[PDB]
Design a protein around this ligand. Structure first.
Ligand SMILES: [K+]
Ligand SMILES: [K+]
Lengths: 306, 306
């Protein structure tokens, strides 16, 4: 199985890494990277890497991408050494602030230069976060795209379409953390641990080598008709904010409990295939999570959008 | 038993509250309060109070005490409602940043105006954090002193005298979090839960009503001579950065396992009394922590320093 590191960069990455650990996501090594020593000390990762100790003295980057970038530059030797040996590196961060925006591209570029298949999974800030955050996030996304093989972008505004109408702001942020965790786990669960219908690493690498950007969609369903319902919810997810038939590559993960059947996996796959372009390169796998009972989760990652 | 709330304000308070929860500190209600939604979502407290949602949009106060203050002002109705009914409120924060420095005094003043015995337990930043942090912390400490009954100040530089010489910066910060937890738990364990030698709430209130400032000291020891060794370490703690004989009031907590003896409690108390002024108002109690084996911890809180 592939050797996989998941790197949480800055506050958005910190929370996503903790959510993966809370969900007992197996087969990956976690590395929390941050300029903010207080936040870093709340990481559940065993490897906690403080960057920019001299520059920022543990105080964070103050929403300044240049300080995030220079912090990662300060610590480039340590970052390179931590990443050495990985076949694949996920770099997770929230865009718009200082450390995510500035450090995540530096870290991703280091991983990519080492030869790791490098996948960024990042949030674009909620519009309510304001103009400075939006502008800085656009800069980070552009930098991230240069530094990775595939960048999966989670449009946080779309979460607001998904959650209940009176959801407090704190809970909207909490859901963004969960979506980042779902983005990484959707891919890693199919390659990091044994399974009946895993994915071939080489095939993941091919779908993750497309240009342009990538998006994700998530569907969850229970009971009768769950496989079809979950798949339909995934392809119609507000998160997948382009028509899936525009994608060059599609990866589908269906996860269920021990009762997940061949018939259900096929049903879900057929829905996603049918919605996608006729000439799409689509790959899929299934995961048994024995902690699930009657729910199934379908995650779709679509790459190579114009 | 007294009804006690422990309020973690901003990043330093967040980490201290999590450390209390990790150490299974009983008998108190925890409330995490923050302008930073990502950090707040890592709180282990069941009550998570986002303040300044409109002003800061979940992004934190950017090391600006005025923004911390105005965030608390925005949310004053919610803060007042959360604090109603408490006999005692601990307000814990790191001084020097925006939310701790600015919001903690507002919150403490609300608690004090409600009639709660209000005790602040705050860190003064490490010198390495720089001049802006030092100056802002001095302002916060002055504000905090006006807003509480007793302010216990933890001089972070003194932690550097305590930890091993090559301790990384991240671990020095982690130890500050632990000291804040020890400051609160030293007092709360003697009044919040049943015990053989608890303290009288009225007596705690008297020692906590002194003017001037307060300091703490911690000593830990195992094996033969543990009670005397721990007590001596507490009174000579670099954290207690004034001669204990200068204090008007002294509170001592000795905590040990089920083997903690009357003789040991007395031995420790005698050491602290002997070191203190002849006319000191000193009170003490003991706690059995059945999770301890042969270690004992002595905590001393000294109040009313000139
Ligand atoms: K698997
Ligand atoms: K007790």
């Amino acid at each position: 199985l592939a050797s996989i590191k998941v790197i949480g960069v800055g506050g958005g990455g910190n929370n996503a890494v903790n959510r993966m650990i809370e969900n007992e996501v197996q087969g990956v090594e976690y590395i929390a990277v941050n300029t903010d020593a207080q936040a870093l000390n709340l990481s559940k990762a065993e490897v906690k890497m403080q960057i920019g100790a001299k520059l920022t003295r543990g105080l964070g980057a103050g929403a300044n991408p240049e300080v995030g970038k220079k912090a990662a530059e300060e610590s480039k030797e340590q970052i390179e050494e931590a990443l050495k040996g990985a076949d694949m590196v996920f770099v997770t961060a929230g865009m718009g602030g200082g450390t995510g925006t500035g450090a995540a591209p530096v870290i991703a570029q280091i991983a990519k230069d080492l030869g790791a298949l490098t996948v960024g999974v990042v949030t674009r800030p909620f519009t309510f976060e304001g103009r400075k955050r939006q502008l800085q996030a656009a800069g980070g996304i552009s930098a991230m795209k240069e530094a990775v093989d595939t960048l999966i972008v989670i449009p946080n505004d779309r979460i607001l379409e998904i959650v209940d109408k009176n959801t407090p702001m704190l809970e909207a942020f909490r859901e963004a953390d969960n979506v980042l965790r779902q983005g990484v786990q959707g891919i890693s669960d199919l390659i990091a641990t044994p399974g009946l219908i895993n994915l071939d690493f080489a095939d993941v690498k091919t779908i993750m080598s497309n240009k342009g950007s990538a998006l994700m969609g998530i569907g969850i369903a229970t009971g009768e008709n769950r496989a079809a319902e979950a798949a339909k919810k995934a392809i119609s997810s507000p998160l997948l904010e382009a028509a899936i038939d525009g994608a060059q590559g599609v990866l589908m993960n269906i996860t269920g409990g021990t009762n997940l059947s061949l018939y259900e996996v096929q049903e879900a796959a057929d829905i996603v295939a049918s919605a996608s372009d006729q000439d799409v390169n689509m790959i899929f796998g299934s995961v048994i999570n024995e902690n699930l009972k009657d729910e199934i989760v379908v995650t779709v990652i679509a790459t190579g959008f114009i």
